[PDB]
Amino acid sequence: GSHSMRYFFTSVSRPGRGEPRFIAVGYVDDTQFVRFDSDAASQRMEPRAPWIEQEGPEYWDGETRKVKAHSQTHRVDLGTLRGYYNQSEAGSHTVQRMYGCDVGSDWRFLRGYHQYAYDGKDYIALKEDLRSWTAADMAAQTTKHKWEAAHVAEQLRAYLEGTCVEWLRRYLENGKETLQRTDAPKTHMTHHAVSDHEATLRCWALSFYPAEITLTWQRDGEDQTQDTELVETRPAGDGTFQKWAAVVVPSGQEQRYTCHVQHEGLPKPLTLRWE
């Protein structure tokens, strides 16, 4: 019954003209609830879930102010990193940041996160103790030295263990109808003859929430990975997710195979077998 709140930020420099493209999104578990896109007309943090619309003007003015300060920090960062890595000013580069907190089943603080990447690779990250930093290279090492002297970890820890968790709990309550509801996968199996002597059984899991799920095939009661294929979990677009796993079997032997589905929304895992 654990939950999380996470913010993702992406800034891409545009050397040909103007400022970096900046996009921020906020999520509670697998539900996006706010966003900011520097290319949008509003220039304001905007709602992406019904339950956040409950917040008043002071909330939106504050989040907008803060998210714009975030974008300027990234803008400066892109410049700083370009120097650290001694890179040309003509190329486009990317800085990403993600932070947030998790509450355990006890609804108490479980852990906090605060990490950064440059051009798609780890740059610097706050360790789990929220007191030390993991720097991936020497550019990141200089950042680490600066943040230790400025005591940045202490400041983040205060937010992650306090404010972060307090708001996560507030959002969970306000949007409890959806956020505290699990949607069990709706499952079924399809049959497709691939030849005169072989067929493909495909096991479907649709409209589930949260995204975490496990689909496994067994043949005569034992796990089988050969002759199988499982697609990456994908968004249905209405807030739920989909996934499927398939296996090729000898025509006529379909009955030996069973699809097993594990999901938080299922009191007990489901077992499917072809008709």
Partner: peptide, 9 residues
């Protein structure tokens, strides 16, 4: 709710 202060790299 977003963090309040953002330190530069």
């Amino acid at each position: 709710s977003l963090y309040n202060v953002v330190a530069t790299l």
